[PDB]
Amino acid sequence: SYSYDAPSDFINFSSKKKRQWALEDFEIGRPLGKGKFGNVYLAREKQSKFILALKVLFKAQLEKAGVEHQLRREVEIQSHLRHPNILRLYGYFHDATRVYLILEYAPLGTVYRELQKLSKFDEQRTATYITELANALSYCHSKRVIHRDIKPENLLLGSAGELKIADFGWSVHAPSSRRTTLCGTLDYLPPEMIEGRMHDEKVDLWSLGVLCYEFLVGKPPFEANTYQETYKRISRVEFTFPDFVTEGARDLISRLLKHNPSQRPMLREVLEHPWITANSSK
Ligand SMILES: Nc1ncnc2c1ncn2[C@@H]1O[C@H](COP(=O)(O)OP(=O)(O)NP(=O)(O)O)[C@@H](O)[C@H]1O
Ligand SMILES: [Cl-]
Ligand SMILES: [Cl-]
Ligand SMILES: [Mg+2]
């Protein structure tokens, strides 16, 4: 069933067909990280010496959890996207045991690692990330695609330090049929998923507000000691700002963290926000 609506043809990374991708086309390097069902390796295409990232998923693990359909959604959606702030999925291929994803290589790693080293981000670095993320989110929503898994671990950094969305393992194409699945990461779950209501593209707006908070504070706003307490604080929208948070950021985060999904602003309003337009570098 590993036949996706996504490229699997060999790509000549030196110009501008018939042969398909194969593991013999790539030199493998150190692993960039471990995933849900397999590591992600730094790789190099042999003919062009082009550096990219190879995400390996073992077919045996995906069937124990029954996530073959979400992998189909991940590969088919991401491979048809073209945006500077979105990680490229050049193609895929598979053998008897594994499924391979030929991903764009982000040289500067994850935003998550930059946040661990700097503890918290300044306002300019935050506003620029939010602008780059909202731009890529607006491109996704223009194709009726909801990411539904916005978190620092899924935000990578390109050559110029620009932000690029990664990991579409929970994304979905919802043109009008609005979805129902409880999915994502705990601290970034929107209220409509915890309370069992049907959600739309406004869940990326909520996770954007949670992300802007953690960028400035260093901890997500609804962080708790258990899943039990985190569920309540997200449902109540129970969070407070430290004193060093400015009124401009205090306004944007509060606008994005509305319990009512319809009251959360549009991505254009986030891009035109006074706090953004004042501190964003892009
Ligand atoms: N193109 C890339 N460049 C550099 N590192 C990457 C790249 N793709 C993935 N990684 C690394 O792999 C990690 C995530 O891999 P992935 O297989 O998507 O995990 P996951 O199972 O989807 N869940 P999560 O690890 O939380 O994102 C990132 O945090 C990076 O450390
Ligand atoms: Cl800065
Ligand atoms: Cl506490
Ligand atoms: Mg994934």
Side-chain angles (χ1 to χ4, degrees):
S1 180
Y2 296 102
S3 194
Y4 302 147
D5 183 12
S8 48
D9 313 317
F10 182 89
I11 300 178
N12 191 332
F13 282 106
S14 296
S15 62
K16 269 73 193 185
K17 230 295 208 166
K18 185 179 182 181
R19 168 163 62 162
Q20 305 298 290
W21 285 116
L23 188 54
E24 299 83 47
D25 285 318
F26 302 92
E27 286 191 8
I28 308 300
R30 60 176 187 87
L32 301 166
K34 184 177 190 309
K36 277 180 66 180
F37 309 99
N39 301 319
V40 179
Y41 297 90
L42 183 62
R44 189 194 303 266
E45 200 282 304
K46 292 185 176 181
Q47 292 188 185
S48 58
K49 291 199 173 187
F50 184 80
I51 289 293
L52 35 82
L54 197 65
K55 177 181 178 182
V56 186
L57 304 184
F58 292 91
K59 297 178 171 186
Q61 300 188 28
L62 280 109
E63 296 160 346
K64 177 182 178 179
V67 295
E68 185 273 346
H69 190 256
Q70 261 298 335
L71 177 60
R72 174 183 297 275
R73 289 148 102 167
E74 177 182 354
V75 180
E76 289 180 356
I77 288 176
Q78 188 175 357
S79 65
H80 291 312
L81 295 176
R82 304 286 183 266
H83 194 276
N85 293 115
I86 300 181
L87 202 67
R88 178 76 178 276
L89 175 53
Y90 292 99
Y92 86 105
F93 65 99
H94 61 140
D95 56 355
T97 56
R98 295 162 277 182
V99 178
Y100 306 81
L101 299 196
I102 311 173
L103 292 171
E104 172 189 356
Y105 162 68
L108 297 191
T110 70
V111 176
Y112 173 69
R113 187 52 189 175
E114 294 293 310
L115 192 58
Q116 278 189 338
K117 301 188 304 177
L118 289 173
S119 290
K120 60 184 184 64
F121 293 160
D122 279 334
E123 294 186 280
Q124 288 181 343
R125 182 157 179 164
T126 298
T128 301
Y129 282 162
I130 301 304
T131 293
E132 297 171 335
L133 181 54
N135 281 319
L137 286 176
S138 179
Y139 179 83
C140 294
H141 292 189
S142 63
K143 296 188 178 301
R144 303 311 301 173
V145 177
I146 324 174
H147 190 275
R148 307 193 301 179
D149 195 7
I150 295 174
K151 60 175 178 180
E153 298 87 323
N154 297 343
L155 303 182
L156 307 188
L157 299 173
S159 72
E162 78 278 36
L163 192 123
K164 292 170 179 290
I165 317 185
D167 196 359
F168 286 75
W170 278 123
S171 63
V172 58
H173 180 243
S176 59
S177 45
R178 77 142 97 112
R179 289 298 181 172
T180 43
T181 301
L182 170 62
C183 60
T185 310
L186 173 61
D187 283 311
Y188 285 79
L189 292 172
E192 47 265 40
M193 291 188 181
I194 289 182
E195 299 161 352
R197 315 180 193 274
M198 338 229 314
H199 66 260
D200 55 348
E201 62 187 0
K202 290 291 188 176
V203 301
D204 294 333
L205 278 300
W206 171 274
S207 303
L208 182 65
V210 180
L211 186 87
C212 186
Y213 186 101
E214 182 169 5
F215 282 175
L216 299 165
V217 183
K219 305 175 182 181
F222 313 104
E223 204 188 29
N225 294 132
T226 53
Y227 279 79
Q228 180 178 2
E229 306 171 6
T230 307
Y231 291 151
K232 297 197 300 176
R233 299 180 180 180
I234 296 178
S235 185
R236 303 169 178 180
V237 195
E238 177 175 321
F239 74 98
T240 57
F241 298 95
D243 282 341
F244 59 82
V245 174
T246 66
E247 298 294 314
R250 197 184 223 87
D251 191 78
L252 213 223
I253 303 175
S254 297
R255 286 178 178 270
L256 287 167
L257 295 185
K258 294 290 185 179
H259 188 289
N260 194 341
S262 60
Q263 292 179 356
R264 302 167 198 164
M266 324 205 72
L267 290 161
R268 322 135 105 185
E269 294 177 290
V270 178
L271 295 163
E272 292 177 330
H273 191 267
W275 183 81
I276 291 298
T277 59
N279 300 267
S280 173
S281 179
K282 191 175 183 181

